[PDB]
Design an enzyme around this catalytic site. Structure first.
Site, mmCIF file in Angstrom:
data_model
loop_
_atom_site.group_PDB
_atom_site.id
_atom_site.type_symbol
_atom_site.label_atom_id
_atom_site.label_comp_id
_atom_site.label_asym_id
_atom_site.label_seq_id
_atom_site.Cartn_x
_atom_site.Cartn_y
_atom_site.Cartn_z
ATOM 1 N N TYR A 177 0.844 -1.194 0.000
ATOM 2 C CA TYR A 177 0.000 0.000 0.000
ATOM 3 C C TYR A 177 0.883 1.249 0.000
ATOM 4 C CZ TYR A 177 -3.938 3.129 0.756
ATOM 5 O OH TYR A 177 -4.885 4.116 0.609
ATOM 6 N N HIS A 196 -14.376 0.882 -7.214
ATOM 7 C CA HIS A 196 -13.003 0.819 -6.721
ATOM 8 C C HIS A 196 -12.739 -0.373 -5.799
ATOM 9 C CE1 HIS A 196 -9.002 2.317 -6.128
ATOM 10 N NE2 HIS A 196 -9.174 2.498 -4.831
ATOM 11 N N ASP A 243 -15.589 2.780 -11.951
ATOM 12 C CA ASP A 243 -14.853 3.243 -10.782
ATOM 13 C C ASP A 243 -14.983 4.760 -10.651
ATOM 14 O OD1 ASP A 243 -12.816 3.925 -8.844
ATOM 15 O OD2 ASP A 243 -11.782 2.055 -9.319
ATOM 16 N N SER A 256 -5.388 0.326 -5.267
ATOM 17 C CA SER A 256 -5.570 1.754 -4.988
ATOM 18 C C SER A 256 -4.233 2.500 -5.075
ATOM 19 C CB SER A 256 -6.247 1.944 -3.619
ATOM 20 O OG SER A 256 -6.485 3.305 -3.322
ATOM 21 N N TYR A 257 -3.738 2.977 -3.933
ATOM 22 C CA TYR A 257 -2.433 3.631 -3.850
ATOM 23 C C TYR A 257 -1.312 2.610 -4.041
ATOM 24 C CZ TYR A 257 0.973 7.160 -2.287
ATOM 25 O OH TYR A 257 2.010 8.065 -2.218
HETATM 26 N N1 LIG Z 1 -9.239 8.398 -0.270
HETATM 27 C C1 LIG Z 1 -8.257 7.637 0.516
HETATM 28 C C2 LIG Z 1 -8.740 7.501 1.962
HETATM 29 C C3 LIG Z 1 -7.582 7.147 2.908
HETATM 30 N N2 LIG Z 1 -8.062 6.834 4.268
HETATM 31 C C4 LIG Z 1 -8.687 7.726 5.040
HETATM 32 O O1 LIG Z 1 -8.936 8.874 4.665
HETATM 33 N N3 LIG Z 1 -9.088 7.379 6.269
HETATM 34 C C5 LIG Z 1 -8.828 6.030 6.836
HETATM 35 C C6 LIG Z 1 -7.987 6.137 8.127
HETATM 36 N N4 LIG Z 1 -8.155 7.440 8.852
HETATM 37 C C7 LIG Z 1 -8.979 8.480 8.401
HETATM 38 C C8 LIG Z 1 -8.916 9.501 9.253
HETATM 39 C C9 LIG Z 1 -8.088 9.178 10.248
HETATM 40 C C10 LIG Z 1 -7.618 7.950 10.034
HETATM 41 C C11 LIG Z 1 -6.632 7.216 10.957
HETATM 42 F F1 LIG Z 1 -6.199 8.038 11.911
HETATM 43 F F2 LIG Z 1 -5.593 6.795 10.244
HETATM 44 F F3 LIG Z 1 -7.240 6.172 11.514
HETATM 45 C C12 LIG Z 1 -9.784 8.371 7.117
HETATM 46 C C13 LIG Z 1 -8.084 6.233 -0.081
HETATM 47 C C14 LIG Z 1 -7.597 6.265 -1.529
HETATM 48 C C15 LIG Z 1 -6.276 6.652 -1.767
HETATM 49 C C16 LIG Z 1 -5.778 6.698 -3.067
HETATM 50 F F4 LIG Z 1 -4.505 7.075 -3.292
HETATM 51 C C17 LIG Z 1 -6.597 6.353 -4.136
HETATM 52 F F5 LIG Z 1 -6.109 6.397 -5.386
HETATM 53 C C18 LIG Z 1 -7.914 5.962 -3.910
HETATM 54 C C19 LIG Z 1 -8.408 5.918 -2.608
HETATM 55 F F6 LIG Z 1 -9.683 5.542 -2.389
#
Ligand SMILES: N[C@@H](CCNC(=O)N1CCn2c(ccc2C(F)(F)F)C1)Cc1cc(F)c(F)cc1F
Ligand SMILES: N[C@@H](CCNC(=O)N1CCn2c(ccc2C(F)(F)F)C1)Cc1cc(F)c(F)cc1F
Lengths: 727, 725
Positions: free
Chosen positions: B508, B701, B669, B591-592
């Site tokens: 990831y 996604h 997606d 994803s990432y």
């Molecule tokens: N949009 C991101 C979301 C990442 N995760 C996220 O925002 N949270 C999960 C963990 N989190 C969050 C707030 C606080 C936390 C924590 F503190 F880590 F727990 C919200 C996922 C994502 C990244 C990409 F690079 C991509 F291409 C697609 C994608 F859906």
């Protein structure tokens, strides 16, 4: 020594030479050599320079295409070519004076012009811009705007919409000049209620948001475009009054429901032929319209109407054929299916309904090429009873029992496939040979039929191919239910009939198709036989053309049945010949062939190990109306919905567990939309069938762009090699 | 004996048992057993029936979800669930009376309702329909329409638009109830100038023309949505006058440019906390807004504003943390990054700018769970100095040097990962263990910290797994440049350290990610180790979280650099351990991770033979603004365009000739658009690189639909097996 490798095909190492000429007079044509446009005299043989290569070095643009006015006064210059659909494109145009030496800066043809064409005599210009027609009497004078109603994706003046371009006229142009240049006939297409097909285009990586492409596209049973036909006088064009276009309406037998304009052919200076076709394409009507010189109107007599119909299928091969009128314009020649179902020339009288057949046989006429006061020249597959062959015949108009083949015995071993190009009033003709030997281009005179000179003999390629191990081509038939069914095999070099070879079934099998012929080809099949030792077999089953209506009309209202079964049956017969490893039988196809390939792989016949389907149809409701309905009628429970629902690839999804399957589709396919493949992939994923996929970003139905063309044939070869276990 | 096969994962043969409870009082919670909703008493242990399984057999609909009003009077019934995006969905709702035994037929909640929520006390209903907010004091009485400006894809009242749902609030709800039920705080989102993303949806084979889906989606640097915050009084709702919503505006330091509303937390009955964030997400401001009881207006004092900023990167982990207010509401607790870069609880005073840290060290606080007048309960990765661990700690408010770990020593071998659920006013708590042993659910009391009873011990699963050859999990670190970097390995059963195993690098590596932890999982990795004898390794390099801002902020304005390189470097160190066949190293990601996987295979390091990229980013200008800009800033020549253009997968196209590459993307997606993969495939086709492709019709996604999830993991396994021979 060497073999015909994949790179030899992809980088086009061994090129076939062509001879591309345009007749301007009854004894003169033009050929461009070293970028020098020369004029070749047929009478003496002496060639003169018409335009030198360095004439447009300081032009500032890469000249895409050129068009010279018939009087040899001006030369239209196409540049900035942007391809739209199959035949359609937008470009920029400059007119160059040949009488002087100057490029015309006054009243230039606008950028992004859809179509431009000269009048048959002189130097009149008709061009379509923003869906509107403009006429120019002189290349430097202002333009007279004929139409005003032209609107993008809604109204089409002088040009065909998607469905008419692809399925009806086989061109972008919907303009028709009269033989003098007096009248400009044109069609109008209304797409207001035609539904849009929408797909993404991604362009360069720089483009942040993908562009959605919207195209008016009528699928099977959907709302069709309407058509109106107009004729305008090009001479009486007022610089102060909007031009008056006289509308010709369709017959009342056509105005009952949906219809298409399927042919426009001029007879004389004031006589025009039109052909109309009902949406259910088993009924056709021809109109012969004269110009009433007093009133200025156009009149098509009900006593001059000719009806074409069929109860066994559709009218024409893909559409009703074009008429060929005699000099006076009181009688026309036309290819019609006779009482036994064979397509021959029928001699019509303008007022009489019954016509007289001038040819007859268990063979078919391909096309009427030229007509003089003495002779009619046609091409047919008569010679030796071979449907896969083409030969030029001449028929005496005074005596219909006097038929002479002009090409049959010229080079019987080398040449069995001919197409011909005639001069004005058919004084001299060029015969072009395309197989089974190397292409042969020869010039002939009509007066005494002597072979004057050899234009191109491809001896340069012949020298190269002697060093390469080339595959051999076998063209034979097999008897099924008392009927001859022709097949062709690309057999590997040093073909040992006692050994077991892997077989790839090259498939199209569409209505009126011909995959078995005498044509010499240098394709992907050549590589697979020469290098990988694979027999590439093609078979023309039921529904294929040039064999009579009994065979062609067999798949009527039954697409995805007989033509599919016959490909499976053909595979059985090839393995029964004993030189086929029946543990290694593959199948591949493009377009319609991809659909049949997909249908075959899902029939559960177990005959085939693997298969490749490139841009396939998956469901006939997804493809356009004009094509689908021609063969399948309407997808309504009252009509033929049963056969529509029964012919899908999606329903045969379970049987794909038995086979290895590679599905390939271009994401920007306007013709057969990615939807088709997307429904297949989904269906297989639903029943747990594993398969192989490959999309192509911003590629159309050809996947023809240089880098994508190479990548797909590379990827397919890899798939075939691993399926056949080849290092 | 048997092994953990692919079918065991795909058909979910060996199931992990959960214990899902909702607290209603300070000593009572609800659990549903055999479709019977029971109420369990924590005081005695005696369980009572609250609602029987046969109560809704004649309901006529398959009950999708339920929500019980806090006072135990009514039960909301969700049915006809239609998923939209990640958290968002439209459904139909019926209210059932628990006092009587009747379904309410009068003034029902409309079909296609976006969001519904009870008030924290009583039985008031707030629901969003057609982008407009509606309040209901009684479940049978008519509804008071609060907002009128709601318009599809343009104006959002009480619900988040795409970018706020996914990247900001992590929910569909943009409604906030006051502790009493007096006020209904809500946000409004304007997407007028937000650009649309357009893709095809093919639906059933029956659908003749594919539907184009249009979604307001702001990519990197594009026009963002604007936000407005309103508060309305739920009591004084006139049946003859349109409700008056008092707007609270953002500070002047925020109104200078583009901004986000990134937090809404109620303090008291008339005190509300708001947090605002600049588009360049290195500056944050908190407002504390009191209700002026005379004028009816809302006032946020300038001397009450608290500022959060960073010069080394962005504010917060993914956003600024939520405040935790004391009972009186004059002081709040908040997780802030200290001077050394470690995230700990800072004790704030409403008027005072400086805060006092109650915790410190070379570790981080994960989240504040509960706050009483005596104790604050938090989870941290302190125990044994393991960042991949989670433990419940309690701190004495009267003495900050008095810290007690309530979970550390309970089952030290079986349990190292904890999350906790507290009752009202934190009287009783449920500790849920998730690894490295089998999940363990226990109920505890806060008063004396004795373990009352075991809710779920997964001994049923334990009996099953004794017959199966299970893989082992190793969690260790490696030292790079004087810094510890944790990795985890899924080692095949009977792992012989003298042999050479093929290794798959599970990736990831996103900002604030953690692929190396103590959690017990039964996934695709379990199959690959148990059956195919492949080591599935994951490595938390630079940019990963829970290890301090020094590590997390390393990839600031540099996405696709360090985090990509560290994954390659990690693979070297694994082969150096001598049990890795360095001729058979693969890499995969989603994803990432799919982006990193793609970047790695295109680095030309030659370390990896093959790789799978599932729904990857290919160019950062293609992904949404809120996420991308948080780490990369703006894609303008004045800002950071250089790093945007340098981090693309397309530029590394040539190096793919060295590797086998499988690219997978769902055609529908909404999150990472098919465009991203389509640009990769095109780039490789341009430079003559052969690869493997696989699209998925009408998949998002997650590619999570039953048939698609099975098909992708079958297809990927086949690709891995042939690559490893
Ligand atoms: N949009 C991101 C979301 C990442 N995760 C996220 O925002 N949270 C999960 C963990 N989190 C969050 C707030 C606080 C936390 C924590 F503190 F880590 F727990 C919200 C996922 C994502 C990244 C990409 F690079 C991509 F291409 C697609 C994608 F859906
Ligand atoms: N659009 C059709 C066009 C069929 N061919 C066609 O119009 N012509 C080929 C030869 N031809 C034509 C007119 C007359 C002839 C001839 F007489 F057969 F020579 C033009 C082909 C097609 C079929 C599919 F099933 C499909 F999915 C896509 C597709 F483009």
């Amino acid at each position: 020594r060497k073999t015909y490798t994949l790179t030899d095909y992809l980088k086009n190492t061994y090129r076939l030479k062509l001879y591309s000429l345009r007749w301007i007079s009854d004894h003169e044509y033009l050929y461009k050599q070293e970028n020098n446009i020369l004029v070749f005299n047929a009478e003496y043989g002496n060639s003169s320079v018409f335009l030198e290569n360095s004439t447009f070095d300081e032009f500032g643009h890469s000249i895409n295409d050129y068009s010279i006015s018939p009087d040899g006064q001006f030369i239209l210059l196409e540049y900035n070519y942007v391809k739209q659909w199959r035949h359609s494109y937008t470009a920029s145009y400059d007119i160059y004076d040949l009488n002087k030496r100057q490029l015309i800066t006054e009243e230039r043809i606008p950028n992004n012009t859809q179509w431009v064409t000269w009048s048959p005599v002189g130097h009149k210009l008709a061009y379509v811009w923003n869906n509107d027609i403009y006429v120019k009497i002189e290349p430097n004078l202002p333009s007279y705007r004929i139409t005003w109603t032209g609107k993008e994706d809604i109204i089409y003046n002088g040009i065909t919409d998607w469905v008419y371009e692809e399925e009806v006229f086989s061109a972008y142009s919907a303009l028709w000049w009269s033989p003098n240049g007096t009248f400009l006939a044109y069609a109008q297409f209304n797409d207001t209620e035609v539904p849009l097909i929408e797909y993404s285009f991604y362009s360069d990586e720089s483009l942040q948001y993908p562009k959605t492409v919207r195209v008016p596209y009528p699928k099977a049973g959907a709302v069709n475009p309407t058509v109106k036909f107009f004729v305008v006088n090009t001479d009486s064009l007022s610089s102060v009054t909007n031009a008056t276009s006289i509308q010709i309406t369709a017959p009342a037998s056509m105005l009952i429901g949906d219809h298409y304009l399927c042919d426009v052919t001029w007879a004389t200076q004031e006589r025009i032929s039109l052909q109309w076709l009902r949406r259910i394409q088993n009924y056709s009507v021809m109109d012969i319209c004269d110009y009433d010189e007093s009133s200025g109107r156009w009149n098509c007599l009900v006593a001059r109407q000719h009806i074409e119909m069929s109860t066994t299928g559709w009218v024409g091969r893909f559409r009703p054929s074009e008429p060929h009128f005699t000099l006076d314009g009181n009688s026309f020649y036309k290819i019609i299916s006779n009482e036994e179902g064979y397509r021959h020339i029928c001699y019509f009288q303008i007022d009489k309904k019954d016509c007289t057949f001038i040819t007859k046989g268990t063979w078919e006429v391909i096309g009427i090429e030229a007509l003089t006061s003495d002779y009619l020249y046609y091409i047919s597959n008569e010679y030796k009873g071979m449907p896969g062959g083409r030969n030029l015949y001449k028929i005496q108009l005074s005596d219909y029992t006097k038929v002479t083949c002009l090409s049959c015995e010229l080079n019987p071993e080398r040449c069995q496939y001919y197409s011909v190009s005639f001069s004005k009033e058919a004084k001299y003709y060029q015969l072009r040979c395309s197989g089974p030997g190397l292409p042969l281009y020869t010039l002939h005179s009509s007066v005494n039929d002597k072979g004057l000179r050899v234009l191109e003999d491809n001896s340069a390629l012949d020298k190269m191919l002697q060093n390469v191990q080339m595959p051999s081509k076998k063209l034979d038939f097999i008897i099924l239910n008392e009927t001859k069914f022709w097949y062709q095999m690309i057999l590997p070099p040093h073909f040992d009939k006692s050994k077991k070879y892997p077989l790839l079934l090259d498939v199209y099998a569409g209505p009126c198709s011909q995959k078995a012929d005498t044509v010499f080809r240098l394709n992907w099949a050549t590589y697979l036989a020469s290098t990988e030792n694979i027999i590439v077999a093609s078979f023309d089953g039921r529904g294929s053309g040039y064999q009579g209506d009994k065979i062609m009309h067999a798949i009527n209202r039954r697409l995805g049945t007989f033509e599919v079964e016959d490909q499976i049956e053909a595979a059985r017969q090839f393995s029964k010949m004993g030189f086929v490893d029946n543990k290694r039988i593959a199948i591949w196809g493009w377009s319609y062939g991809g659909y049949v390939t997909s249908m075959v792989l899902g029939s559960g016949s177990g005959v085939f190990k693997c298969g490749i389907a490139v841009a396939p149809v998956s469901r006939w409701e997804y493809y356009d109306s004009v094509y689908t309905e021609r063969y399948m009628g309407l997808p309504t429970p009252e009509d033929n919905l049963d056969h529509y629902r029964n012919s899908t690839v999606m329903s045969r999804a379970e049987n794909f567990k038995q086979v290895e399957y590679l599905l390939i589709h271009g994401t920007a396919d306007d013709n057969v939309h990615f939807q088709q493949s997307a429904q297949i992939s989904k269906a297989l994923v639903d029943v747990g069938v594993d398969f192989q996929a490959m999309w192509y970003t911003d590629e159309d139905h050809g996947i023809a762009s240089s880098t994508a063309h190479q990548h797909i044939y590379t990827h397919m070869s890899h798939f075939i090699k691993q399926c056949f276990s080849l290092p």
